[PDB]
Amino acid sequence: TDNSSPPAVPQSFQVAHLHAPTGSGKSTKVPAAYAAQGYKVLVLNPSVAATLGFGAYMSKAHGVDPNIRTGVRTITTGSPITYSTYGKFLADGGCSGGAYDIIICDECHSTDATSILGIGTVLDQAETAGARLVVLATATPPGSVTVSHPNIEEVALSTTGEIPFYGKAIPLEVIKGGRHLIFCHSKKKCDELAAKLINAVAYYRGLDVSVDVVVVSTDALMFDSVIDCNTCVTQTVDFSLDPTFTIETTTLPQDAVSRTQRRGRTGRGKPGIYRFVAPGERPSGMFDSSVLCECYDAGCAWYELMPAETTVRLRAYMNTPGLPVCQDHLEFWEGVFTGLTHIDAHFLSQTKQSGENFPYLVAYQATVCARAQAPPPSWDQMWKCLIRLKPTLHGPTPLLYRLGAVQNEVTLTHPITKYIMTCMSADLEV
Amino acid sequence: NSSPPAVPQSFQVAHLHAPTTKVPAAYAAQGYKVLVLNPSVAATLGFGAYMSKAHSPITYSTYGKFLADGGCSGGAYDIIICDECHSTDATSILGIGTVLDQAETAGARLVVLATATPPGSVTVSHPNIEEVALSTTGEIPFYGKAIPLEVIKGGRHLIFCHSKKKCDELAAKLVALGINAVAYYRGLDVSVIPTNGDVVVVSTDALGDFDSVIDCNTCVTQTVDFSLDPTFTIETTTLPQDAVSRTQRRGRTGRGKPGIYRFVAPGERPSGMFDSSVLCECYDAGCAWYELMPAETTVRLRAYMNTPGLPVCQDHLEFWEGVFTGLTHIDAHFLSQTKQSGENFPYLVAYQATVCARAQAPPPSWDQMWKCLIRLKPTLHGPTPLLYRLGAVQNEVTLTHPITKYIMTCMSADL
Numbered sequence: 100t101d102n103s104s105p106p107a108v109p110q111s112f113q114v115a116h117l118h119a120p121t122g123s124g125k126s127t128k129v130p131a132a133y134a135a136q137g138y139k140v141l142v143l144n145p146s147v148a149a150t151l152g153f154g155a156y157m158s159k160a161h162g163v164d165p166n167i168r169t170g171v172r173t174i175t176t177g178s179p180i181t182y183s184t185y186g187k188f189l190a191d192g193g194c195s196g197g198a199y200d201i202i203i204c205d206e207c208h209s210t211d212a213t214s215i216l217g218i219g220t221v222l223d224q225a226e227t228a229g230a231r232l233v234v235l236a237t238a239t240p241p242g243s244v245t246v247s248h249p250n251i252e253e254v255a256l257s258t259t260g261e262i263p264f265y266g267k268a269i270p271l272e273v274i275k276g277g278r279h280l281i282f283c284h285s286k287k288k289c290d291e292l293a294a295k296l297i298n299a300v301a302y303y304r305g306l307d308v309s310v311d312v313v314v315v316s317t318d319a320l321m322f323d324s325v326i327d328c329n330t331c332v333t334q335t336v337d338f339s340l341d342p343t344f345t346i347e348t349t350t351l352p353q354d355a356v357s358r359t360q361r362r363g364r365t366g367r368g369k370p371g372i373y374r375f376v377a378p379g380e381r382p383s384g385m386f387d388s389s390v391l392c393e394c395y396d397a398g399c400a401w402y403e404l405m406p407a408e409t410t411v412r413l414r415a416y417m418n419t420p421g422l423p424v425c426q427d428h429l430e431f432w433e434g435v436f437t438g439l440t441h442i443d444a445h446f447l448s449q450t451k452q453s454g455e456n457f458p459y460l461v462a463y464q465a466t467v468c469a470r471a472q473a474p475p476p477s478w479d480q481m482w483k484c485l486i487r488l489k490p491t492l493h494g495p496t497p498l499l500y501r502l503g504a505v506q507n508e509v510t511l512t513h514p515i516t517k518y519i520m521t522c523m524s525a526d527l528e529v
Numbered sequence: 530n531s532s533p534p535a536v537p538q539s540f541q542v543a544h545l546h547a548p549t550t551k552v553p554a555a556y557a558a559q560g561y562k563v564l565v566l567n568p569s570v571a572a573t574l575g576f577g578a579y580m581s582k583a584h585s586p587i588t589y590s591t592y593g594k595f596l597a598d599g600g601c602s603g604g605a606y607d608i609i610i611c612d613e614c615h616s617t618d619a620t621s622i623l624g625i626g627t628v629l630d631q632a633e634t635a636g637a638r639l640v641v642l643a644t645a646t647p648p649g650s651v652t653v654s655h656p657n658i659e660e661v662a663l664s665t666t667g668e669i670p671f672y673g674k675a676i677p678l679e680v681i682k683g684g685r686h687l688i689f690c691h692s693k694k695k696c697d698e699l700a701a702k703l704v705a706l707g708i709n710a711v712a713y714y715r716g717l718d719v720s721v722i723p724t725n726g727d728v729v730v731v732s733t734d735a736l737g738d739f740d741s742v743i744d745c746n747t748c749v750t751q752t753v754d755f756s757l758d759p760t761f762t763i764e765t766t767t768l769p770q771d772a773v774s775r776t777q778r779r780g781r782t783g784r785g786k787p788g789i790y791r792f793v794a795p796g797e798r799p800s801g802m803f804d805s806s807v808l809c810e811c812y813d814a815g816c817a818w819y820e821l822m823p824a825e826t827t828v829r830l831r832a833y834m835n836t837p838g839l840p841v842c843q844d845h846l847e848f849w850e851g852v853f854t855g856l857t858h859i860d861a862h863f864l865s866q867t868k869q870s871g872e873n874f875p876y877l878v879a880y881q882a883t884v885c886a887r888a889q890a891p892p893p894s895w896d897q898m899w900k901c902l903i904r905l906k907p908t909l910h911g912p913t914p915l916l917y918r919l920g921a922v923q924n925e926v927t928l929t930h931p932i933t934k935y936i937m938t939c940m941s942a943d944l
């Protein structure tokens with residue numbers, strides 16, 4: 100059941116789509132109104148700062164002290180309103196019997212691994228746990244394109260101008276001076292776009308913050324004008340058959356959510372300017388198979404889910420209409436992780452702690468290397484859990500799959516490598 | 530936007546989001562010479578008169594012919610309607626881009642970018658077509674779901690599979706269960722039974738009318754991979770169908786009589802995006818067919834990309850312009866042969882053949898696209914100097930050709 104207004108609570112279980120503008124209190128006004136009717140309500144967000152910031156707002160302005168549930172900080176007050184991150188909801192085990200009448204999946208357009216595994220978990224479990232209503236809330240449903248902003252200047256940036264931007268040319272005036280934000284697809288391009296620059300400072304993170312100025316930043320940032328390269332760097336899987344698959348990055352046209360949010364960081368009350376390298380954009384609503392791979396990695400590394408349980412939750416996500424779509428590779432990734440047995444627990448513990456991208460994949464490749472007394476695929480910091488070059492310098496690397504640049508010599512005959520190749524044959528089409 | 534643009538007083542580019550011929554009629558009625566461009570001027574139904582049939586102030590042609598005719602001429606038209614402007618085939622993209630680069634200098638007052646599927650469109654309900662998700666319950670396995678034999682036992686049915694291989698296997702298992710199943714794909718003709726007898730057609734999109742459609746909701750598309758082995762790879766990937774594909778497949782049921790649509794996946798790719806390989810096709814076709822310098826091709830593609838509301842692509846224009854600019858002294862006779870045979874990248878195939886011929890080396894494989902080299906006893910004599918991969922390689926390769934080093938450098942500096 101799709102709509103622009105807060106769907107009333109049905110007598111029996113339903114999943115409803117809520118498509119409403121961002122500030123219009125989908126995360127605050129909607130849960131409060133459900134609560135004023137006497138319902139216990141859960142509000143899920145991808146962001147820890149958002150989660151923490153909703154709790155804050157409702158206290159400052161509203162005299163309501165919600166339960167707040169994040170990895171870093173958990174507060175229990177007994178309020179009918181709970182705010183939680185998707186990831187903390189997953190750690191809590193998902194839906195616990197009878198706890199909530201309503202579950203709002205906020206920003207349900209998010210395609211990060213936890214949002215998708217989280218939403219999938221709600222859709223698989225909410226009815227059984229006694230929820231009456233699941234609400235799938237976003238401002239930007241699948242298919243969305245960016246629209247006119249009343250209070251934002253948008254004028255095409257042309258050939259003529261004095262700086263090398265992105266095949267186009269911003270002309271002096273516009274960043275001298277005042278406060279200006281400039282988006283680039285990469286860290287490197289940030290650090291020496293600014294080096295060329297008028298006051299200017301680069302952000303992408305590792306860094307904290309550094310608030311007349313010109314900021315040159317990736318999207319890692321959480322303003323008179325915005326300057327937009329209109330492109331983003333995205334993680335994709337390549338089924339490279341060398342021997343198996345590769346996790347790499349690709350530079351794509353930004354999609355609608357990207358373009359709106361980048362533009363959105365100007366013109367907040369004060370009329371602001373948006374300028375661009377390129378007019379068009381990807382519509383919102385697609386994500387990559389590498390995100391499914393992330394989901395299984397996280398189930399295994401963080402949430403103690405057998406691959407087959409993760410599948411059940413992600414299957415719930417894919418059978419649900421009006422959500423971002425991706426290749427159906429559930430069988431394949433399930434097969435892959437299911438064959439990854441007896442990981443070395445200490446290596447897993449380190450890769451998780453170290454914040455690597457696929458800590459299960461990293462720790463498992465390191466496990467194979469240790470047990471074959473072979474070196475990691477490179478001596479990149481990804482593999483530092485093997486600092487102990489000395490015995491495991493014995494020869495070529497038994498290469499399960501590609502997570503980064505590979506520097507060592509490699510061997511492609513390890514049974515796990517052959518196991519994954521067989522899974523590729525079994526589960527991937529044409 | 531939803532109504533036909535009034536003709537503006539100076540040159541402008543308008544968008545027409547029409548719903549699911551009336552339009553260029555209106556314009557002509559006011560004395561304006563109207564040119565309408567579509568991918569094809571065949572009848573939409575596949576049955577009926579050509580759009581170009583006489584009985585003018587209204588010409589109907591194709592992007593293909595328009596490009597072959599060399600584009601806009603002089604002062605032939607007041608209004609150019611680029612119809613079906615969601616099309617992301619190379620010919621439509623170079624054609625539209627050509628209209629936009631040239632129309633104003635040709636004295637048109639208006640260009641209309643018309644489509645029923647603007648970028649971001651999803652498919653909408655159909656009053657005449659009931660949709661029912663496939664479950665995992667059923668005797669016939671179908672893309673992770675199952676078809677119950679009941680819903681195709683008797684009656685007439687269309688099942689879409691993404692590949693010809695998949696069509697044959699499914700049809701074979703249907704026959705082994707007593708169903709009248711024919712497979713269809715590019716290369717077959719008559720085998721579909723028009724006689725209202727029971728039948729299930731298992732086909733690709735190569736494809737009477739049907740009680741139901743069953744859709745794998747996947748498709749195959751061309752992509753470029755920047756694979757560094759040594760340079761790039763034109764390949765094919767399997768993707769979730771987009772909205773025009775879904776709408777179109779579902780649309781082969783429920784015409785007149787009500788119909789059923791059964792699916793594997795409830796959702797789609799949104800329309801409005803295409804691959805960098807399409808750019809590559811455009812430069813290939815610019816050099817092979819239209820006598821276009823690479824920079825002239827850039828100029829037409831650039832005008833496309835500066836136009837809002839159009840399908841979006843990676844901006845690899847400088848990259849592709851750079852590689853084709855480097856492809857010098859192609860053997861003219863190989864070029865003729867690759868053009869005539871209908872290879873997909875006739876310039877690239879023939880250029881690779883040319884570099885093989887000069888270096889007296891074999892082609893990457895002996896699949897049919899390399900047949901201009903059949904004069905062979907000299908030329909199977911060492912490694913293949915591989916410029917790029919246009920298909921499966923079989924031969925030993927060398928990476929040491931200048932042009933290979935050249936393309937590699939374009940990849941590093943432009944991408």
Ligand SMILES: COc1ccc([N+](=O)[O-])cc1Cn1cc(CC(=O)O)c2ccccc21
Nearest residue numbers: 147169170171184186187190212213397401
């Ligand atoms: C840092 O932990 C990560 C990191 C990445 C991902 N992920 O898959 O995207 C998932 C997790 C797991 N995770 C993510 C969260 C979200 C949060 O920190 O509130 C969380 C909370 C408690 C316990 C585990 C939690």
Ligand SMILES: [Ca+2]
Nearest residue numbers: 337339754756
């Ligand atoms: Ca590849």
Ligand SMILES: [Ca+2]
Nearest residue numbers: 337754755756
């Ligand atoms: Ca690749």
